[PDB]
Amino acid sequence: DVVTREYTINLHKRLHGVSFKKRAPRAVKEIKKFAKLHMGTDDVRLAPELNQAIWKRGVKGVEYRLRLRISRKRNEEEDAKNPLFSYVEPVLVASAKGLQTVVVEED
Amino acid sequence: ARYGATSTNPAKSASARGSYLRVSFKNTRETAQAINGWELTKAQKYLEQVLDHQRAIPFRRFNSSIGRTAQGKEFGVTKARWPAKSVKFVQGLLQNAAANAEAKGLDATKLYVSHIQVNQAPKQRRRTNKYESSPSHIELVVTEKEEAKKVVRLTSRQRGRIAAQKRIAA
Amino acid sequence: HGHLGFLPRKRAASIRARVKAFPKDDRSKPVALTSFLGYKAGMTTIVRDLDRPGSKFHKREVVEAVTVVDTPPVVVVGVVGYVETPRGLRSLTTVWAEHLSDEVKRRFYKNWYKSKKKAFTKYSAKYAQDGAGIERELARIKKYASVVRVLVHTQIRKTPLAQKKAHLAEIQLNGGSISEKVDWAREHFEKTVAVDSVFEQNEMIDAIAVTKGHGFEGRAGQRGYHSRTSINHKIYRVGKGDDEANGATSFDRTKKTITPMGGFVHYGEIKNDFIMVKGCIPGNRKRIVTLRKSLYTNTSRKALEEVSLKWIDTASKFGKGRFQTPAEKHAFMGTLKKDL
Amino acid sequence: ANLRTQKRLAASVVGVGKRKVWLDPNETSEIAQANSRNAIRKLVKNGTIVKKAVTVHSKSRT
RNA sequence: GUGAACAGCCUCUAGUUGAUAGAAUAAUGUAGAUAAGGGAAGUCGGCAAAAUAGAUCCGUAACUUCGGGAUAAGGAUUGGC
RNA sequence: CGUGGAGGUCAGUGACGAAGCCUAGACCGUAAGGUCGGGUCGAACGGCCUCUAGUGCAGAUCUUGGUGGUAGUAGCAAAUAUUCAAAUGAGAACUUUGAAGACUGAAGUGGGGAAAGGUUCCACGUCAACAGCAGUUGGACGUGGGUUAGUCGAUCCUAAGA
């Protein structure tokens, strides 16, 4: 199904204990795994603005909580093996605390 | 032609060959023995799963001091690996053999790997002590499955005993 | 170096350590279980008002570390008879109860979620019209068995554990003739046995468990995760789950249960019966532990002296806990910003 | 495309380092057709190649 | 810029992002640290670590070839406004 | 008993298959060895009487060449550090562009020379080998283009010396 949701990912507990030189690359991989877990798609594409937010404070300064918008969409190329894929984009909020998973009514 | 020892009908077979291939002989021997005798579709799906690290290739001879893995349990071994280069070469050869069978007009659902063989190609050297590669020759044959007087020298006494039995019976 | 009797230092074959010796039986006594199953749930501290003549601490109060073992009642689900042979004890017959919970039926599967759950479904058909086969097997046990053990399982669903698969064990029945043992088992099929019908306060018990695992250590090799049998641990309290004021003594009138503030760390609250045992026992939190009766009639005045507890520490174990109850914490701090 | 030569020529033509020239990721074929300094100059004029501004080193705290 | 300073540390112009990668995080090894109480009891042997360290003010012994010893030793101070 | 070559002879064997090699096959001899069948192969070769010698190997830390086990094992842990998207392409962790994060930090990972090297410079094409993974990249390979002086040097002068 074509669907769009907004999630909060707790990067603090997913990055607990990771070496400082690996925190932001590990966050990239964790977000890919998180999107795969929630949408079922093995093809996760991250927005460069999302990567910018991840790397905002250097390689070892990733934020504790991140508000994401994940859109599972149809692969309209008809070339890739997976029928669907997920696109992860950042959501700009003052604070990422206290927010629950919501459904976006795309219009 | 000029393949290894094969005991199969040529008219129901197709062949594929690859020589001087820049891939490890030991790894490729393990891959080929993993495939030997399987159905063609089963082997192809298996090699895809190996590429995806969901199933492994058991290493039975060239397996000294390699890692142990739960994915060996399928074949009763404890040592299995995922040789990507070997898998790619072998599945290229499988695709070539399947195409040859299609051109020959063989029924692709009955095809199984009836022969597969890896031996060593001439070594290629580089220097940076010997520093050589171990290339492979690979050959394989896929074949269709097909469903499905001794005179005796008795002595005179033996013949007499047989006749006595016959007379005693009906 | 090391005690050569604990060789080889290899991993225990199971997570549940085996009871390798039950107390010597005395047939004149009533029928009793020799052992019980529990789950280790953290430690805490108590103040004991000591009455020990001869000691420098006679008529004085001491502070002791204690272990709390969560012990919801066990379910009796079977009986097994043993015959002695020139080659040792041999099991002759196992008889099961008619109905078994999913808690114990999970023990017989590697992949419960994927199964048809057919276990014991054909066995239950023996209790069909007369129970003649069940009665014949019980008669066989009564006639030939020299040792009778009962099959029990824990109620792990009553614990805070994520595991749904119950632990199953044999517990020797001591006291009474063989026929009386078998009758007791048959009467208790599908029934629960509580920890206070097995043990009582002031009694010395033994703790059998597999110790904390430490992996590879530098000869080098496996360290920890060994079966151990520690003896002579005194029971300071047999508490009740349905009892409020589990942690309240005659000297401390605060109505509070045994559970520390914030819960035990890596283990939830205690909502069942429990055993408070003086000192430490092998294993770590959440480990299944076996509590055994003393093998011998203890000749120590320690096994005889009654335990009078003055206070049980229910402060938080998740930090430097200062308050026994949240009411005390609120009364100390006062009114916070979000209270208004 | 390989715009290594185009990046070098844009640096020379604008007079700044290669670290200060911007090549439009959308006009890739158009830039790839630019093999001459005159073509680079035309692309600079119409904005396909842009000189970036210097990284600020302010002396306010000093 | 800091600072006595072509020191160390951070930045602008210019240049580079090269070094086989991925997943785990047991012991051991190497490098770098911390530690109750005691304080050389260790060892052939205080080996190695620790402690000291800039600048201002005070103050400075024996010996001396009168030039030194000397930053002798030993004290006080250091931010912001 | 066996080998290279020489004189004589068997009007010896042979493309209808000499020699050689392989053989789970056969026979003779105490043995050195000899003979036959089958396969493979393609141009020469044998028996006997004699002549002649660079004439018989398990060794010599033997010579030259080839090849194993070790072993898919040791190892590719300095140089703080990479990441997202698109393009190209059969194929992209490594090419190109954009976006981020870092670094050398003016005694530079910046810009020039002497000497040395010799085309490495630039473009187009290309990946069999090489750049100790990869590669669509390259100081690699193929093909072309490129170095302009009265004033910058040499050339002139003398030095130690020859």
What features would you describe in this structure?
This is part of a larger assembly, with chains A (107 residues), B (170 residues), C (340 residues) and D (62 residues). With 107 residues, chain A is of the alpha+beta class. Chain A is built from three helices and five strands; from the N terminus they run E-H-H-E-H-E-E-E. Chain A has helices spanning 11-15, 23-39, 48-54, and strands spanning 3-10, 44-46, 65-74, 84-90, 102-103. The longest helix of chain A is centred in the N-terminal third of the chain and has 17 residues, at 23-39. The radius of gyration of chain A is 14 Å and the shape is globular. Chain B is an alpha+beta fold and 170 residues long. Chain B has one domain (9-148). In chain B, helix 1 packs across helix 3 and helix 2 (40-51) runs antiparallel to helix 3. Chain B starts with 12 loop residues before the first strand and ends with a helix. The longest helix of chain C is centred in the middle third of the chain and has 13 residues, at 132-144. In chain C, the strands form three sheets. In chain C, strands 1, 4, 5, 6, 7 and 8 form a six-stranded antiparallel sheet that branches. Chain D binds two RNA strands through helix 1 and helix 2. Chain C: Keywords: Cytoplasm, Isopeptide bond, Methylation, Phosphoprotein, Ribonucleoprotein, Ribosomal protein, Ubl conjugation. Chain C: The modification Phosphothreonine is found at residue 93.
The rough form of chain D would be described as elongated
Number of helices in the DSSP assignment of chain D: 3
Number of helices of chain B: 4
- Number of DSSP E strands of chain D: 2
- Count of discrete structural domains of chain D: 1
Strand order, largest beta sheet of chain D: 1-2
Helix content of chain B: 25-40%
Main sheet attributes: strand count, strand direction, barrel closure of chain B: 3 strands, antiparallel
Question: What is the H/E string of chain D?
Answer: HEHHE
Q: Per CATH, what is the topology of chain D?
A: 50s Ribosomal Protein L19e, Chain O, domain 1
Modified residues (Phosphothreonine) (chain B): 69
Protein name (chain B): Large ribosomal subunit protein uL22A
InterPro entries (chain B): Ribosomal_uL22 (IPR001063), Ribosomal_uL22_CS (IPR018260), Ribosomal_uL22_euk/arc (IPR005721), Ribosomal_uL22_sf (IPR036394)
GO molecular function (chain B): structural constituent of ribosome
Strand-helix topology:
This is part of a larger assembly, with chains A (107 residues), B (170 residues), C (340 residues) and D (62 residues).
Chain A: E1 3-10, H1 11-15, H2 23-39, E2 44-46, H3 48-54, E3 65-74, E4 84-90, E5 102-103
Parallel strand pairs in A: 2-4
Antiparallel strand pairs in A: 1-3, 1-5, 3-4
Chain B: E1 13-21, H1 25-35, H2 40-51, E2 57-58, E3 80-81, H3 84-104, E4 111-120, E5 124-126, E6 131-133, E7 136-144, H4 156-168
Antiparallel strand pairs in B: 1-7, 2-3, 4-7, 5-6
Chain D: H1 4-14, E1 21-23, H2 28-32, H3 37-46, E2 49-51
Antiparallel strand pairs in D: 1-2
Chain D binds 2 RNA strands through residues 1-5, 7, 16-20, 22-26, 28-29, 31-32, 35, 54-57, 59, 61-62.
